[PDB]
Amino acid sequence: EARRVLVYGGRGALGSRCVQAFRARNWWVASIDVVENEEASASVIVKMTDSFTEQADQVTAEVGKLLGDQKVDAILCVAGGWAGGNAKSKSLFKNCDLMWKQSIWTSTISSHLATKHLKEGGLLTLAGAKAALDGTPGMIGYGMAKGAVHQLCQSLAGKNSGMPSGAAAIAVLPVTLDTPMNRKSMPEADFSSWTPLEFLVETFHDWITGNKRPNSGSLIQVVTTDGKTELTPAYF
Amino acid sequence: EARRVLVYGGRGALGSRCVQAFRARNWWVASIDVVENEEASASVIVKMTDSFTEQADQVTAEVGKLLGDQKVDAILCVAGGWAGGNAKSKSLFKNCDLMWKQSIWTSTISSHLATKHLKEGGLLTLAGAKAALDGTPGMIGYGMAKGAVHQLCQSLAGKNSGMPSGAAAIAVLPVTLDTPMNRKSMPEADFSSWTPLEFLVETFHDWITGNKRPNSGSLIQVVTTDGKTELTPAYF
């Protein structure tokens, strides 16, 4: 029960799969990323800038003009990426900068967009990390970025957060996704423990059409063992 | 047991009290803030910029030149500030931008500085928020900022985070501090539930000189009831 979806990070591995999948069902899908998705119904290009407010104002304004008075069924915030490094790393700063822009910036704008354009009873999905439920000594930036997302998910389920009535804010907490990039970069790893993209797509679909949707403010761990994926709630 | 301290946010309410207090004991104290602290032994001025890596590289380089081969007993990261707003707020973006720069940026550089300049058995203090242990619907940015700090504290206590041997990473989680600004801005509030600055200063002093120091990765709630402050551990 949905025909209007926004995919934030629409050109990423997951995001791309979503656009394709929803377009195949004849849903109207807009992709919001640093580059265009010609497969989407519409594309919003995020401006590359160090200025958060400049980027945010730009996306908000453009989505505003694109939607008009139309509300969407869901906003899938699937933007992110990974970078490692401990506190001593020479690349700490560069990596932190990137991690913040990919996960914190996107999560924040998404949240704002949800308050303005999500239908009542609609869905917002955020991208967290199972690893970020604890200290992440070998990946400072990433852990911090994802931790903040987790926290934000809590805020949105609270009274007077600005979320539309009956809408839900849900964070997905994966370990590793099965992507060609992951495959090339971790060639001798056990792919049988990586989550297929299709599994998430099918899950999102369920959540949208009212099937098995968890409460707002839920942190859902996505863990794959021997090619079988399971969903397990985690508490903040 | 200390004579060398760095205060990050050295010109803030708390930070200022620290510099004064440690200088009074004849300790060498450097203040790192957006403005100079003429009361400190030394002052490092953070460059105002939207570029995280530009700001970070600048502080790191300058602290490096200032310290040389000298290690410090402690780094008190007391930088922050507060801004409110739900997800629907028109000022969300502006407020988020500020919250991130004051708490996330500072916490991150501080952490990096600790790995390079903290003595073994030294201390790093971070500034969190009791409120950020849950969803903060009325203060998105703040909650996110402080949540990330909490998470980072966890990372630094982990194996191979880059922290010097025996040093500790401790986050302080206040409710409200007794500041003249708070007083002017919340005039009919119960000041008897606000934490005196001196209490934190005395606490920091204890932590530095080895008295009653909690484990690394500790989240210490600071709660004042009827002018009596108490320290209570919280778990991530």
Ligand SMILES: NC(=O)c1ccc[n+]([C@@H]2O[C@H](COP(=O)([O-])OP(=O)(O)OC[C@H]3O[C@@H](n4cnc5c(N)ncnc54)[C@H](O)[C@@H]3O)[C@@H](O)[C@H]2O)c1
């Ligand atoms: N792949 C994994 O192993 C793994 C493990 C845990 C979590 N995750 C997460 O799940 C989500 C989906 O992962 P993925 O594998 O599809 O990621 P991806 O790297 O393949 O795709 C992320 C997308 O985000 C876009 N993006 C980055 N910053 C952006 C901004 N400011 N505005 C707009 N778009 C921006 C990128 O351009 C890219 O298209 C991400 O948050 C990712 O971190 C992935």
Ligand SMILES: NC(=O)c1ccc[n+]([C@@H]2O[C@H](COP(=O)([O-])OP(=O)(O)OC[C@H]3O[C@@H](n4cnc5c(N)ncnc54)[C@H](O)[C@@H]3O)[C@@H](O)[C@H]2O)c1
């Ligand atoms: N005052 C309260 O009621 C209250 C409640 C909870 C937490 N806290 C926190 O405890 C810590 C001490 O609080 P305070 O009352 O002394 O804060 P403050 O606002 O009075 O001082 C913070 C300082 O941080 C500096 N700063 C901000 N961004 C900076 C950057 N990028 N580089 C350097 N310096 C930067 C500011 O210039 C200011 O001097 C802060 O993290 C604050 O958020 C305060």
